[PDB]
Design a protein around this ligand. Structure first.
Ligand code: RIT
Lengths: 99, 99
């Protein structure tokens, strides 16, 4: 699709057997989601850093559907003020900025 | 242009007689820049919110050139870890997300 930016670009995703809402965020390197239970192995990752770091669980090669595009990528699971799709998954869906 | 998202979408802007670099950030409602001196009237604005608010100066109807597109919009001037072009100016340049 083509998404204009008059409102926040919130989209529906399908992950770990759930439908969630998340923000398409070109300002974020990584994808961070809260309250999803993902199977298999993970390793801890420190993110943020200003004022301290936040520890999250890094899951690799996660299948995720974003607007009906089935892709694979890293998902960080942990506390976040809002669910964020970052550049790592936007590249996978072939999402670009255009003007 | 078409900007892919494998790297951070940093672009050159012209503002307040200066060339600056800023991040095209679809996760940000507003545009926040530091170390720019803008003429005329402003009013304080509280932004952020998590852990406290940050006070910045809100300038309206500022002429700004973003990748050669001359546009007009609100610029918040104040401390920011990185210069951010938010949705308010992306709409002005006609910037969309596409996949
Ligand atoms: C909480 C939720 C309901 C939201 N609040 C908002 C309102 N706010 C505050 C903003 O629009 N904020 C803007 C902003 O930066 N956007 C933030 C929104 C936000 C708000 C509150 C708490 C946490 C994040 C989200 C932005 O993408 C920020 C801005 C930024 C980017 C790079 C470097 C420095 C700074 N950046 C990031 O999210 O980077 C985090 C990364 C994660 N993985 C790699 S980088 C301002 C700078 C203009 C939007 S969505």
């Amino acid at each position: 699709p083509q998404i204009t930016l008059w409102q926040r670009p919130i989209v529906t995703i399908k992950i770990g057997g759930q439908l969630k809402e998340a923000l398409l965020n070109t300002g974020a390197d990584d994808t961070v989601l809260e309250e999803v239970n993902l199977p298999g192995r993970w390793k801890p990752k420190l993110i943020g850093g200003i004022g301290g770091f936040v520890k999250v669980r890094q899951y690799d090669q996660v299948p995720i559907e974003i607007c009906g595009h089935k892709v694979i990528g890293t998902v960080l699971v942990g506390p976040t003020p809002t669910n964020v799709i970052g550049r790592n998954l936007m590249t996978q869906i072939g999402c670009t900025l255009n003007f």
